Design an enzyme around this catalytic site. Sequence first.
Site, short mmCIF file in Angstrom:
data_model
loop_
_atom_site.label_atom_id
_atom_site.label_comp_id
_atom_site.label_asym_id
_atom_site.label_seq_id
_atom_site.Cartn_x
_atom_site.Cartn_y
_atom_site.Cartn_z
N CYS A 70 0.93 -0.89 -0.19
CA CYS A 70 -0.12 0.14 -0.32
C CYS A 70 0.77 1.14 -0.39
O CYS A 70 1.99 0.94 0.73
CB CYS A 70 -0.96 -0.03 1.39
N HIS B 79 11.71 12.81 10.11
CA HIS B 79 10.22 13.32 10.26
C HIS B 79 9.51 13.08 8.91
O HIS B 79 8.24 14.17 9.60
CB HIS B 79 10.18 14.73 10.49
N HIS C 27 4.53 9.82 10.26
CA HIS C 27 3.65 10.11 11.79
C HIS C 27 3.74 8.70 11.95
O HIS C 27 2.91 7.76 11.04
CB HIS C 27 2.65 10.81 11.54
N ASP D 118 -6.17 -3.70 18.55
CA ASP D 118 -5.48 -4.98 19.10
C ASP D 118 -4.00 -5.19 19.60
O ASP D 118 -3.82 -6.47 18.98
CB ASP D 118 -6.79 -6.10 18.61
N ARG E 290 -0.32 3.19 15.00
CA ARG E 290 -0.68 3.07 13.44
C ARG E 290 0.45 4.36 12.81
O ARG E 290 0.62 4.59 12.55
CB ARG E 290 -2.12 4.03 13.47
N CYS F 202 2.72 5.31 9.99
CA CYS F 202 2.40 5.03 8.51
C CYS F 202 3.59 6.29 7.90
O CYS F 202 4.40 7.60 7.72
CB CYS F 202 1.18 6.79 8.57
#
Length: 136
Positions: A66, A103, A106, A114, A120, A122
Site C-alpha cells: 500500500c 520526520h 507520523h 488490538d 499506527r 504511516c
Amino acid sequence: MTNFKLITDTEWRQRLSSEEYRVLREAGTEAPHTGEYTNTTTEGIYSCRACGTELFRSTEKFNSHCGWPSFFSPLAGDKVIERTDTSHGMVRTEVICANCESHLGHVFAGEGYDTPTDLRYCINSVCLTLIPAEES
Ligand SMILES: [Zn+2]
C-alpha cells in the site's frame, strides 16, 4: 554509523534520492511512485534510504502492499525515534529515524488494532529500501 548531522548538503544529494533529500531534511512530504527501483516484493526488514537502518521489520508489519500502510512497534526503537509536536491544542507523534531526521512519517496511538502498542505508523511512502530477509 557516524553522525549524519555533520554530513554536507552535497553528500546528502549524492547519498539518497532527490525526494529523500528534501523529505528527510525538513519533512517536505511523503509521496510514493518517485522511484522505479523501489521493490517491496520480498517481506523482510525496512531500511532508511538515507542511511539504511533497520527502521521497521516484518515482525510488527501488518500489510501486503500500500502507498500509506500501517505498522506496529518497530525493531527496537533504536533505529527510529518517536516524538510529539504541540502544533496546536492537540499534538501529533512524528516518526523520525534514530540516525537521521526522517520526520517524513507520523504514528498514531489509540487506533484500536488490538496490539500491545496500539500504534499506527504511516511511513514507507517516499521510496524506502526493503531488505529481503529470506522468503525461501
Ligand atoms: Zn535514516
